[PDB]
Amino acid sequence: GGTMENLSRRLKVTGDLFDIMSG
Amino acid sequence: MSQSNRELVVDFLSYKLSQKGYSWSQFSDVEENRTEAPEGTESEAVKQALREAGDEFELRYRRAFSDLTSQLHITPGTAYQSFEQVVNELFRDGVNWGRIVAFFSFGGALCVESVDKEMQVLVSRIAAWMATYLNDHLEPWIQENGGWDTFVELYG
């Protein structure tokens, strides 16, 4: 219950830092 | 532009698992046959960026929020849910490269956790959940913001 939700949160932030649009 | 996204799913998952000490073809079937383009292939470069991106992605997460395999919790009856749950909330706020980098990172991570636990078969199961979501859930977003060419342009 309190594993996947927290996990996604961590992946989410990492995404913002490693996302960008193009170039 | 978009030829065999599955190859990208099988590759990343096979690579990460290969780094943990697991073999893809050992229990993946790859729904065809382990081959993967040699070099100089378009799709080939795609996996290259996914491997480089996932590496940097999982690294930051590993350095900040520690690894992933040593946190989650999948079982023979909650693997498809654990994945859908993290992928749902992850792409709920809005799809995007960062969300896809994690999508692939979680996929390979789950496989390693499932294999380490007692569900090597889940590797291929997740392989279909990830690929399917990739081609059916976020694929449109891919070609939307440039596609694998952009992801490769940002990471490559």
Report domain extents, chain B: 1-156
CA quadruple B109, A7, B84, B140: dihedral sign? negative
In this structure, whether the domain defined by B1-156 belongs to CATH 3.40.50.2300 is answered with no
Q: Identify which of A4, A14, A21 has the shortest CB distance to residue B145.
A: A21
Place of tokens 């050992």: B26
Contact status, residue B36 vs residue B11, Cβ threshold 8 Å = yes
Two tokens at A17? Answer: 């830092």
C-alpha distances (whole Å) from B49 to each of B8, B57, B125 are 10, 11, 24
Token pair recorded at residue A1:
């219950």
Separation between Cα atoms, residue B65 and residue B17, nearest integer Å: 20
Residues 6+ apart with CB under 8 A from B20: B69, B112, B116
CA-based nearest residue in chain A for residue B146:
A22
End-to-end CA separation in angstroms for chain B = 16
Query: What is A1-23 written as a DSSP string?
Result: -TTHHHHHHHHHHHHHHT--S--
